[PDB]
Design a protein around this ligand. Structure first.
Ligand SMILES: Nc1ncnc2c1ncn2[C@@H]1O[C@H](COP(=O)(O)OP(=O)(O)OP(=O)(O)O)[C@@H](O)[C@H]1O
Ligand SMILES: Nc1ncnc2c1ncn2[C@@H]1O[C@H](COP(=O)(O)OP(=O)(O)O)[C@@H](O)[C@H]1O
Ligand SMILES: [Mg+2]
Ligand SMILES: [Mg+2]
Lengths: 175, 470, 51, 494, 471, 72
């Protein structure tokens, strides 16, 4: 039940970033907050400690999260005073999923037997950008020695599988 | 101004619009979707607004089945509640919840006006000052349980007793004597019996005065909610425009409340006592207070009531009964005896059976008929076991006049003319009070036990007894 | 008896068929796929592009 | 074998398999939640990575409430669920006849696969008010108390309700056995039973030659409550396949109360709020969706019908419970079986005073109406006058003659197990009862009189039985009187 | 090496978190073995059974012993398999706990033994066998009014202290000595005292060395008491599958299976159901009881005692297990307080065996006429209770007079009840009790007093007791 | 009538085994026969052998509090 709440928080910050005109700064700040909280897991356990006063926890957030923009810091302090600071990485994931749709870029995970060339991935992105609807498309390539002699792609929640689907389709059609 | 579907939770669908473009409560939403590929189903739904959630999200109630709905489907806002056609166009036509013709006689064009389902009740300034009696022509109804003009009636009857025939001659009598349109609203009760009632509408000729609305057990409970309001807003046109004394038949209003209890658990409400929705008294009253007699016309309503397991203490029969003014209890023991209509005379009560409303003479004659029939339903085991020869020559006079009264409570109907050949009668209140007074005085003790059977007036008793030779 | 023959026949068939799959994969690995991987891929995009 | 394999490899075409997927959040108790699945439908077949099917019921904002239609022990958190692209369907056809089948449609009896070509959705709307016709033709059960006092027509749903071990399943199997001469297609839906009980039922159907036209749908107690939930809807979908073709179908729902318990489990594990007795809100809607699909279509819709016999098991005669009063308020009449009558020798234990048939009279043939209209009066008079014969002084001779007629009425209405009686013999034995041809004969010989009278009608006379079979009316009340007196000459009172 | 931390300890319920992609399937055994690093810790040898999946790669488990001592963060071993119980010829003459470990001080089973998993699906439709032949017990109510089916499921429904453990011990004494096959006793939530007494009676009478005993008695936490019956059942399943042999299952208080499920269901995150029982009250008992079947290989005739809570037969746990049983005997407290032992309700006890084609015509006529007279006497108890025996119309007096004799001649002395009263007890053949009830229904023994029929085997013993009384 | 001891009975000191059985019989007969006692004429057993024994059993089995009796 945390993704639906982080979607609301990230949509509020997203509308602020649209109406302000500083979307790149807010996106860089959200990526910095996500990387800093992924690199350090004890900060949530520190701010969940109840003997620390709320003014002291606001002092820790205002000291640590400095250099980021004003609405990102206001969002972090608002999540602190609403006791919803545990969902800040979920907020970062939802906000980056909002701004990727804002830019028009989509993320995809590719599996192939051999690592493909740099032109073939751009060709696959130029093919699949018309099918998905985005202007720019991203391919993540994994080595994956299980599949043989083909490429399969999971973009969004749709899998375009044609690598080992021939052999499985054959042994399902014969038997 | 056209939004997405977020949740599909059984019959409850959650729809999110744009900011500032929310629909008001009870507005009808539309989903008209064509299948984009083979992985989709063509869908035509109508949703009514029920709640407003947090972030532009609206919980709705579906009128048809929600099977096939995809999250993210486009929802059309109509800007109005469920509009239902009314007028002389609805006479003889069978309708669903959405005011669409179920039967294949045609479709109603878009030029006709359509009254909305949801309407406030008539004010205190507008109602009738004192009670008028809706005169039916039925001797049990006019004598012992008088129907007021604008009130609510409870039919307590099952099948095989003659509920539909009583319904049809109520429609016929109010159509020929008061100029009154009737409206039948079948609320969640046995599609087969609604089909039988419609074919008997067609056979009796009663269909040409009746508008009919059917939403049965098969439909989801939002449909079974809004059926009775569809029939009531069809009746309100004739009342508020034609000034008529309209009948409005709701079969099994218990289904109108239990459909609400089925929806309210999924809408997110805390359960009330006995599992019934918490808003049960208000949802009952917003139906029952639009059934009133104003200064212009009237809407009287005969309403069948199914009591589950004959428990009269659960809250939904209690709140149906608190709106009732009279009951007519249809008994199988009188239908097997040959008494048509099989209205139980002692158990059927009325609020109008009081001498300030019916008069002194009608009240005294009705009370004495109730006293002799109650004294007769104390000797039943004694007659059945110990016999007639042993009772007394004072209580056998009681059972004598009790049988003469009990067979004179039955009529020949106009809608039973096609079955027996007898034309049927409309009996006024003064003549049936005079007839039961003359039987109570003892003027007709020499006439036999029959010739009271299935006659309108007491001159017909004299003519039938002279036709029998006596 | 007639059902028994028809079910044994399908089962055995499935065992041969299983063997045949395992090898199908092994032998396809065995072939030299520099040419094939570029060819397949180019065809696959084209093939995806059409459907 | 290998030539067909080579031909199908030569006919094989390789394409890209596209699929909408979604990873599982929770696995447990036959219930799964899943991220993804953005374009799924409500009430849709969706399938896991094991091949186990699931039904997508609850579509929340961030997950899908998947209802697992098989063994969930192989499904783990992190597996993907594949969107099949079609609503939950049931394989229907003539190949299901004589087969014990899963509610998903797989063969369970182990006699090979079921070769069906087309399917029907498991959630379909009932025929409307205009789509039907009034029930007018008999569903002859073979039980004389049912076919005389609580009659069942084609297109009628009748609740057969009572305690355990009162005789419900025997009424079902006897009714299914009687449909051999008729054009009726039976369907016995076994819900939540022990599977050896289902095998006993199937073997008693095979012994009496009843598997030539019946379909057994079993959802045993070891199967998950998702499969007990979808068993009556699969049964009525298999029925309405034949109903919308012109055929006549009988669908027996053994213990719909176990469907109510399975749907209660199904809703409590999906975290839906309870109601009274912790049953969810749409339990009446649950039973009404399957009991309004039983209808009799009009002559424009084909004319075919589907009559239903749902069962509800009560607890110690508590007929005022929630699921009994839900199903009583749906069906077109009730058949009350009571252990009080069952252990007093009266079997079938049908309490004909409390039992109602709301179609009744239009269901009977013209002979059975004439004969049973006074049967009901004699039995009602006996039920009313037996109350004063429990203790006390005595009763006079007239109502003692009424009590004697009623005792012989009770002895007529008793049957044996799995012995259905044709209607032309039922009208003759109840004609002999009601016209006074049994007052010569003591109460302890009425069963043997009936058993020998059926044999007498088979080997002597038999022009009366052809008259009742062709004209559906009594043979002019004088050949009947001389035939019954000619048999009473033959009968030797013990 | 895929090992996990302990997240939550919630009574008998432990949450375990593994690394992503390495979660165990449902019903796998997990092991906790901790060695108490300092003085503020406790040595732990605890095992866990996977029950659910929670998301955030956390696993919801049920413990088999006490969780007193577990620390958030302990290391959990994944065995990759369900609770494997050692099985074979080794289990004969031995006593086991829920985990298959021997608790009878006679040694330990080596690791080379064959061991089957506890959790397996039920036998299919094509594998079942539905032959009905009568198991003769020597109990007159059981032989006459509800014959036990050889190879079928038998239920003993009773309240507390009503005569149910005594009746299942009488069934052991009459049936299990002369069975000529394997027996399996499974004590699920009964007295540990009764686990010792019954073991020493097996050692005395020599019925041991062909029985296998599993005790998960009422001292055990509920996660054990659920899987006790499944351990004893897979011990029975080895014999009827691999050896094709007739197996006796005696299970005392199979109600404790559903009750031990109900104790854990609140802590598993499940919503409550009717009467506080799990929502899965039907399918948890369907995964157990549909698995106790006879197949084409071998048969299991299971005799199960079933506790009835607060003497309420409409309680959801006894009401949903009537549908599983071929024959039921419903013990009543009203009959136990009258001194009628076995306190079997003659009317409410039914069987699939009681049919003329299965038992015989004369047996069926005598049994149904006994039930007819007892139902007619049950319908008169209001008139007898208020107005008395004085106003019955001289055939109802005859019905009451014969029905007191019938209801007392249903009672019987046991071999087990010799330690209760001193009377040595009797074994009655089926033809003897059919001839006895036929002689009572004909009115042969209307002259004898009705207390002469109490706790008596045969009608010759009725006559000798009645002449010892003075008649 | 309602108070049972299962595992006791094998605990007694072999004198109470000899003595207390007919005490149980006499007290059970008295408690089941006293409810229908004051009606009609008493039988030759119910006059003295059962009721006049059971009254003495009831008077024996009464005690005063805080006065335990040794078993001998
Ligand atoms: N004429 C009869 N009608 C019905 N049952 C009969 C008749 N004659 C004998 N019986 C016996 O009554 C019993 C009824 O069992 P049935 O299979 O009907 O169970 P049920 O009523 O479905 O309830 P349950 O399945 O829970 O026992 C059968 O065992 C059968 O032997
Ligand atoms: N056949 C019998 N004869 C005499 N007493 C009995 C008999 N059966 C049971 N009882 C009494 O009823 C009680 C029932 O206890 P028991 O059957 O051992 O356990 P449960 O609590 O399972 O019923 C016992 O205390 C015993 O004294
Ligand atoms: Mg049954
Ligand atoms: Mg016990």
């Amino acid at each position: 039940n945390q993704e639906v709440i982080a979607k609301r928080y990230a949509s509020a910050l997203f509308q602020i970033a649209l109406e302000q005109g500083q979307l790149d700064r807010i996106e860089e700040d959200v990526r910095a907050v996500r990387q800093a909280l992924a690199e350090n897991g004890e900060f949530l356990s520190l701010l969940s400690y109840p003997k620390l006063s709320l003014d002291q926890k606001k002092a820790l957030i205002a000291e640590a999260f400095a250099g980021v923009s004003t609405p990102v810091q206001n969002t972090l302090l608002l999540l602190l005073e609403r006791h919803r600071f545990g969902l800040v990485p979920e907020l970062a994931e939802q906000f980056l999923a909002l701004v990727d749709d804002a830019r028009g870029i989509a993320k995809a995970v590719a599996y192939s037997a051999r690592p493909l060339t740099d032109e073939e991935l751009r060709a696959l992105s130029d093919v699949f950008a018309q099918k998905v609807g985005k202007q720019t498309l991203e391919i993540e390539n994994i080595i994956d020695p299980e599949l043989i002699g083909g490429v399969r792609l999971r973009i969004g929640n749709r899998i375009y599988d044609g690598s080992v689907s021939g052999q499985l389709e054959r042994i399902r059609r014969q038997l | 101004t056209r939004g997405r579907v977020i949740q599909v939770m059984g019959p409850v669908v959650d729809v999110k619009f744009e900011n500032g473009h929310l629909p008001a409560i009870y507005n009808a939403l539309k989903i008209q979707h064509k299948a984009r590929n083979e992985n989709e189903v063509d869908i035509d739904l109508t949703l009514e607004v029920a709640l407003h959630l947090g972030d532009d999200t609206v919980r709705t109630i579906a009128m048809a089945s929600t099977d096939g709905l995809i999250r993210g489907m486009e929802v059309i806002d109509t800007g109005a509640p469920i509009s239902v056609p009314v007028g002389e166009v609805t006479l003889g036509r069978v309708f669903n919840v959405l005011g669409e013709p179920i039967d294949l006689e045609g479709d109603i064009p878009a030029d006709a006006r359509r009254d909305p389902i949801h309407r406030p009740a008539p004010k205190f300034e507008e109602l009738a000052t004192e009670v008028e009696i809706l005169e039916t022509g039925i001797k049990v109804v006019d004598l012992l349980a008088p129907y007021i003009k604008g009130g609510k009636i409870g039919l307590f009857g099952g099948a095989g007793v003659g509920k539909t025939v009583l319904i049809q001659e109520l429609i016929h009598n109010i159509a020929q004597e008061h100029g009154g349109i009737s409206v039948f609203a079948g609320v969640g009760e046995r599609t087969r019996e609604g089909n039988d009632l419609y074919h008997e509408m067609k056979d009796s000729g009663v269909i040409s005065k009746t508008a009919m609305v059917f939403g049965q057990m098969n439909e989801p409970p939002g449909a079974r909610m809004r059926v009775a309001l569809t029939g009531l807003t069809m009746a309100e046109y004739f009342r508020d425009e034609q000034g008529q004394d309209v009948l409005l038949f709701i079969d099994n209003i218990f289904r109108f409340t239990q459909a609400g209890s089925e929806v309210s658990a999924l809408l997110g409400r805390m359960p009330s006592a006995v599992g019934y929705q918490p808003t049960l008294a208000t949802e009952m009253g917003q139906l029952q207070e639009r059934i009133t007699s104003t200064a212009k016309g009237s809407i009287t309503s005969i309403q069948a009531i199914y009591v589950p397991a004959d428990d009269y203490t659960d809250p939904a029969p209690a709140t149906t009964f608190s709106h009732l003014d009279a009951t007519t209890n249809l008994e199988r023991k009188l239908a097997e005896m040959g008494i048509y209509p099989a209205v139980d005379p002692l158990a059927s009560t009325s609020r109008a059976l009081a001498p300030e409303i019916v008069g002194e003479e009608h009240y005294q004659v009705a009370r004495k008929v109730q006293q002799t029939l109650q004294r007769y339903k104390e000797l039943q085991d004694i007659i059945a076991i110990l016999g007639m020869d042993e009772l007394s020559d004072e209580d056998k006079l009681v059972v004598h006049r009790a049988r003469r009264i009990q067979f004179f409570l039955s009529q020949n109907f106009h809608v039973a003319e096609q079955f027996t050949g007898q034309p049927g009668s409309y009996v006024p209140v003064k003549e049936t009070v005079r007839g039961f007074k003359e039987i109570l005085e003892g003027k007709y003790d020499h006439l036999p036990e029959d010739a009271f059977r299935l006659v309108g007036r007491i001159e017909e008793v004299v003519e039938k007894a002279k036709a029998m030779g006596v | 008896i007639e059902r028994e023959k028809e079910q044994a026949m399908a089962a055995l068939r499935e065992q041969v068929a299983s063997l045949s799959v395992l090898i199908a994969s092994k032998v396809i690995e065995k072939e030299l796929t520099e040419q094939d991987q570029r060819k397949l891929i180019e065809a696959y995009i084209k093939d995806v592009q059409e459907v | 074998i290998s030539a067909l394999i080579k031909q199908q490899i030569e006919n094989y075409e390789s394409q890209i398999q596209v699929s909408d997927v979604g990873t599982v959040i929770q696995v447990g108790d036959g219930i799964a939640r899943a991220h993804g699945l953005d374009n799924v439908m409500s009430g849709e077949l969706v399938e896991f990575a094991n091949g186990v099917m699931g039904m997508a019921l609850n579509l929340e904002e961030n997950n899908v409430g998947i209802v697992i239609l098989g063994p969930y022990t192989g499904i783990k958190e992190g597996d993907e669920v594949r969107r099949t692209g079609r609503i939950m369907e049931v394989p229907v056809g003539e190949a299901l006849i004589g087969r014990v089948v899963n509610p998903l449609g797989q063969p369970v009896d182990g006699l090979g696969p079921v070769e069906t070509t087309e399917t029907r959705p498991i959630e379909s709307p009932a025929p409307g008010v205009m789509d039907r016709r009034s029930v007018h033709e008999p569903l002859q059960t073979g039980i004389k108390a049912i076919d005389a006092l609580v009659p069942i027509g084609r297109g009628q749903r009748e609740l057969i309700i009572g305690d355990r071990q009162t005789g419900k399943t025997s009424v079902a199997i006897d009714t299914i056995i009687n449909q051999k001469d008729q054009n009726m297609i039976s369907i016995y839906v076994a819900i939540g039973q022990k599977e050896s009980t289902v095998r006993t039922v199937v073997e008693t159907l095979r012994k009496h030659g009843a598997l030539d036209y019946t379909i057994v749908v079993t959802a045993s107690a070891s199967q998950p409550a998702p499969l007990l939930f979808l068993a009556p809807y699969a049964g009525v979908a298999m029925g309405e396949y034949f109903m919308y073709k012109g055929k006549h179908v009988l669908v027996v729902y053994d213990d719909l109360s176990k469907q109510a318990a399975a749907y209660r489990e199904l809703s409590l594990l999906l975290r839906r709020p309870p109601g009274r007795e912790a049953y969810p809100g749409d339990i009446f809607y649950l039973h009404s969706r399957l009991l309004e699909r039983a209808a009799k279509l009009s002559d424009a819709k084909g004319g075919g019908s589907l009559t239903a016999l749902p069962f509800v098991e009560t607890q110690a005669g508590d007929i005022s419970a929630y699921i009994p009063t839900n199903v009583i308020s749906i069906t077109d009449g009730q058949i009350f079986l009571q252990s009080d009558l069952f252990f007093s020798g009266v079997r079938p234990a049908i309490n004909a005073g409390l039992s109602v048939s709301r179609v009744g009279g239009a269901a009977q043939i013209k002979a059975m109406k004439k004969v049973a209209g006074t049967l009901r009066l004699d039995l009602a008079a006996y039920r009313e006058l037996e109350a004063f014969a429990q203790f006390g002084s005595d009763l006079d001779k007239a109502t003692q003659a009424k009590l004697a007629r009623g005792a012989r009425t009770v002895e007529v209405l008793k049957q044996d197990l799995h012995q259905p009686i044709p209607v032309e013999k039922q009208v003759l034995i109840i004609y002999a009862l009601t016209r006074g041809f049994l007052d010569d004969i003591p109460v302890e010989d009425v069963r043997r009189f009936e058993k020998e009278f059926y044999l007498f009608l088979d080997q002597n006379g038999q022009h009366l039985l052809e008259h009742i079979r062709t004209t559906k009316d009594l043979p002019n009340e004088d050949d009947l009187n001389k035939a019954i007196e000619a048999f009473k000459k033959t009968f030797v009172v013990s």
